[PDB]
Design a protein around this ligand. Sequence first.
Ligand SMILES: [Mg+2]
Ligand code: NA
Ligand code: NA
Ligand code: NA
Ligand code: NA
Ligand code: NA
Ligand code: NA
Ligand SMILES: [Zn+2]
Ligand SMILES: [Zn+2]
Length: 180
Amino acid sequence: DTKTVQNGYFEDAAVKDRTLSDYAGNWQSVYPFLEDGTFDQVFDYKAKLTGKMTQAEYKAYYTKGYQTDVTKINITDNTMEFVQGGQSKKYTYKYVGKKILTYKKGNRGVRFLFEATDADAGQFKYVQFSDHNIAPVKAEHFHIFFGGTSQETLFEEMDNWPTYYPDNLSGQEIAQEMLA
Ligand SMILES: [Mg+2]
Ligand code: NA
Ligand code: NA
Ligand code: NA
Ligand code: NA
Ligand code: NA
Ligand code: NA
Ligand SMILES: [Zn+2]
Ligand SMILES: [Zn+2]
């Protein structure tokens, strides 16, 4: 609610290009920790804090948001590897820019855009990151968008945003970070 950058209130002029290195690391999907109940304490806290949704409403919102079969993503300064249903796919990426999206509430967010240079990248040819930041800084978590047509197609996806935290965290530590 407060008008901060990470709540989506920022000046256009402060939005600056990033590089894939901001996202380098070994990352894990948070979805298993929603599914196993670890985040129930998060949804209970959020409901009691904001009053915007009940616990069940929050769980449904985050179920839609977090669902993915991409269980792990490993990122270097120039590559991304997606582990998805018994297969690993790794491609080399270039930065292709950024996009400011305006949400219905009136706040905004920035997606940082990457394109695979490999010819056979398929649904991983176009990849975008959202992490509540608008300019270079090491990512602490991210929400990903990916597909095989264009960056612009992905700007239409607002309700599913598979979400990733560092592999060295337990689900309990991820819950702690979400409560903070
Ligand atoms: Mg996991
Ligand atoms: Na800036
Ligand atoms: Na999936
Ligand atoms: Na998952
Ligand atoms: Na591979
Ligand atoms: Na927009
Ligand atoms: Na972002
Ligand atoms: Zn986030
Ligand atoms: Zn978010």
